[PDB]
Amino acid sequence: SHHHHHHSTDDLTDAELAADLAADAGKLLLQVRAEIGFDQPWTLGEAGDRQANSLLLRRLQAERPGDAVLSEEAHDDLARLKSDRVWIIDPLDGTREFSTPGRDDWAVHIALWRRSSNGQPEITDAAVALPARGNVVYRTDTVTSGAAPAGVPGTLRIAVSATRPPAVLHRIRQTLAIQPVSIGSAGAKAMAVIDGYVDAYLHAGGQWEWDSAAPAGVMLAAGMHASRLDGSPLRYNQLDPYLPDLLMCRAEVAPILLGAIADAWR
Ligand code: NA
16 A cells, blocks of 8 residues: 655565565465475475575565675674664574475564664564465564463463473473473464464574564564563574573463473572
């Protein structure tokens, strides 16, 4: 729709652009999936990440030529460290899931980091697409707050995905009734929290910035919780863009889980 340039496609707000980029990459990923098919999963996953990255860098160049870009799929020249505006993107989160027939738990992550003196809310705008799920795009400018708790009281559903369960989860399951819910891709795990399909998404051991920046942005915009496991803020555009761990969860469950994590270390 035709509109006036936002106060303070061409002429999108940053959140609009994040959403449009996520949707466009999502469509391309769906095209690649259809074209290549599933008989060679390695090749499928590689073609998808490579082509989605090309689309995203091309369009960020065109529509935001002054902004820096940290992409999972591109070399990192560290110019971003000097920038006040940095896109943190994963063109394809969940290559295994993308390359498996029938699975829809893979995502595209598009996040804008903006330099903040005080307030520290670094990811200002973001979108997560789940292309196989009707190409739904979750966006910081439309997600809503106040979601009503869905599960049986006294039991937590927690999205996790790992080649092996972390020790901290073993410990907190001694004290809290938890059902681990196996979902692929960081993006799908996080959006399950937004959806109310699970109560929390927990990750121990490292994760790259591009797989949590967009989910975290959307989570905070929805009034939910996103932090390190020790409760300190997630930091982005770091020299080493790697987060040792994280918790995203609905607001009501944050104190219980942060508490259990802290008590684990006793
Ligand atoms: Na990727």
